[PDB]
Structure formats: C-alpha cells, structure tokens
Ligand binder design. Structure first.
Ligand SMILES: CC(=O)N[C@@H]1[C@@H](O)[C@H](O)[C@@H](CO)O[C@H]1O
Length: 176
C-alpha cells in the first residue's frame, strides 16, 4: 500500500534569506558553504506498507551553465549559480546532480508488512559565476526541479501522485 501525503510544491530555503562569507572569492566560480540551510526536507511524503518497495528520482530544470567537480553548476542569473542535491530523507544522503534528465537519487528500500513513510530532501549551494561591481547578488524565486517516487520490485504507484516539485526561495548573496 502507498499513499501521497505531502505537498506538490515545496520552497527550497527560507524567503528573504541573507548569506555571508569571508572565505575567498578571488578565482570565481566560488561556492558558499551554507551547509544544508538552503533546501527542503519532508521525511513524510508517501505512506507505504506491505513490502512496498520505493526509490527516488530527481530532475533539475535550470540550465547547466557548467560543471564543478563532476557535479553540474546550474544557473539562474548571469552571475549566480548553484550546486544542487536531491535524494532521500537525511540531508547527508543527498546525490549531487548533473544535466536536466531524470536521475536516480536514492537506491530505495522495501518496507515491511507494516506502515511506514517515505521521504525526500533537497539542499543547494549558491555558486557565484561572472564578476560584479557591488559584491552583491540578488536571487528571485525560480523553479528548480522535482523528485518522483520510483516503485520497484513489482511495486505499483497507480494513479497515486508520484511527483512533487521544488522552487528556490528568493534571497541575496553578500560577502564581506
Ligand atoms: C523517519 C520515518 O519514519 N520515515 C522514513 C522516511 O523518511 C525515509 O524516506 C524512508 C527510507 O529511508 O524510511 C522511513 O522510515
């Protein structure tokens, strides 16, 4: 048994967020290490039971303005980009992202003959692209991508909602 209990649209990171870094941005691109603060986590998006086996798929829509260490830097504005992560519940369980096609983000599992729940989590890292002349970057609310449950081992979804989508909450990058 499965069931959708979460929400279709989920905002990544809080609104009006301010971030700072005194590290080093000499040789762009630079990537703020804000940990997992800009993201989304709902360990309860699908209710499952009876051997139901589920995995997790993710897909970012933003264009690939490049690639950082085998990961795809996704762009928003001329000067701003991001390192995107998607996967299962525990933020630490994230799977970096490359391209704009559906990729496996969580190997999944097979619950027992009891009632549990299936979750997901997104986390992003703000990348600075092209130079500026104010040392300040704005970020307007923009779509990012989605996650879709992956029923396997003979498991079925049916008409039960399989995908939820994400959106990047606005914010601004500082540095000083
Ligand atoms: C904490 C909880 O009760 N629900 C978790 C769910 O968030 C997670 O997606 C799934 C697979 O790891 O395992 C469930 O037990």
């Amino acid at each position: 048994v499965v069931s959708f209990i979460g929400s279709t649209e989920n905002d990544v990171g809080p609104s009006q967020g301010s971030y700072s870094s005194t590290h080093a941005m000499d040789n762009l691109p630079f990537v703020y290490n804000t940990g997992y603060n800009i993201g989304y986590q709902n360990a309860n998006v699908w209710r499952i039971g009876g051997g139901f086996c589920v995995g997790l798929d993710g897909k970012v829509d933003l264009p690939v303005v490049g690639s950082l260490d085998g990961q795809s830097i996704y762009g928003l504005t001329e000067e701003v980009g991001l390192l995107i992560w998607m996967g299962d519940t525990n933020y630490s369980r994230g799977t970096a992202m490359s391209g704009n096609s559906w990729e496996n983000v969580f190997s999944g599992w097979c619950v027992g003959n009891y009632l549990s729940t299936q979750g997901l989590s997104v986390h992003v890292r703000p990348v600075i692209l092209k130079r500026n002349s104010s040392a300040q970057y704005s970020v307007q609310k923009t779509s990012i991508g989605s996650i879709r449950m992956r029923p396997y081992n003979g498991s079925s979804a049916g008409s039960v909602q399989t995908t939820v989508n994400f959106s990047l909450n606005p914010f601004t990058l500082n540095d000083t």
